[PDB]
Amino acid sequence: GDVEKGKKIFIMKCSQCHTVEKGGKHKTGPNLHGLFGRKTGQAPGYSFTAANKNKGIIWGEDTLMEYLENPKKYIPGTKMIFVGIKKKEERADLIAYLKKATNE
Ligand code: MH0
């Protein structure tokens, strides 16, 4: 579960829709800008589906694991078009990379 292993998850499955670039840009999906320590569904340019706001718990290390197991069930109302990440090891490298890049 680290950054260098973890970018090889996001760049493969995710970067086709998302970015993690400082100063922000827009794609099929949001820029992840300061994702950790918050709920989303509200930002000046991002997260237009809002079950992301109403889920009662933040993005963190054991909430992204269970979201990424099956997205449309953990957030029952999202534009996240992705079925689920079968491995927990890959989810753990992915979350590690995002904690380095979203806080940067
Ligand atoms: C484009 C079809 C698409 C792919 C592929 C994709 C992969 C991954 N996502 Fe997505 N994603 C959305 C929301 C999230 C989300 C919350 C972001 C926020 O609220 O700012 C997270 C943490 C996340 N996605 C993570 C991953 C990830 C890792 C991968 C690869 C496994 C939304 C919903 C936001 C909105 O309402 O606009 C969209 C549109 C979305 C698209 C895609 N994600």
Curated annotation (Swiss-Prot):
GO cellular component term, pick one: nucleus
Result when mutating C14S: Decreased covalent heme attachment
Pfam families per the UniProt record, alphabetical: Cytochrom_C (PF00034)
Result of changing C17A: Decreased covalent heme attachment
One of the GO biological process terms: mitochondrial electron transport, ubiquinol to cytochrome c
InterPro entries associated with the record: Cyt_c-like_dom (IPR009056), Cyt_c-like_dom_sf (IPR036909), Cyt_c_1A/1B (IPR002327)
Molecular function GO labels: electron transfer activity; heme binding; metal ion binding
UniProt-annotated binding residues for heme c: C14, C17, H18, M80
PTM sites of type N6-acetyllysine: K72, K99
Residue positions where N6-succinyllysine is found in the record: K55, K72
Modified residues (Phosphotyrosine): F48, Y97
Localization (cell): Mitochondrion intermembrane space
Documented effect of changing K5 to A/D/R: No effect on covalent heme attachment
Modified residues (N-acetylglycine): G1
Keyword vocabulary terms for this entry: Acetylation, Apoptosis, Disease variant, Electron transport, Heme, Iron, Metal-binding, Mitochondrion, Phosphoprotein, Respiratory chain, Transport
Family according to the record: Belongs to the cytochrome c family.
Chain's role: Electron carrier protein. The oxidized form of the cytochrome c heme group can accept an electron from the heme group of the cytochrome c1 subunit of cytochrome reductase. Cytochrome c then transfers this electron to the cytochrome oxidase complex, the final protein carrier in the mitochondrial electron-transport chain. Plays a role in apoptosis. Suppression of the anti-apoptotic members or activation of the pro-apoptotic members of the Bcl-2 family leads to altered mitochondrial membrane permeability resulting in release of cytochrome c into the cytosol. Binding of cytochrome c to Apaf-1 triggers the activation of caspase-9, which then accelerates apoptosis by activating other caspases.
Associated pathology: Thrombocytopenia 4: A form of thrombocytopenia, a hematologic disorder defined by a decrease in the number of platelets in circulating blood, resulting in the potential for increased bleeding and decreased ability for clotting.
Designated name of the protein: Cytochrome c
Species: Homo sapiens
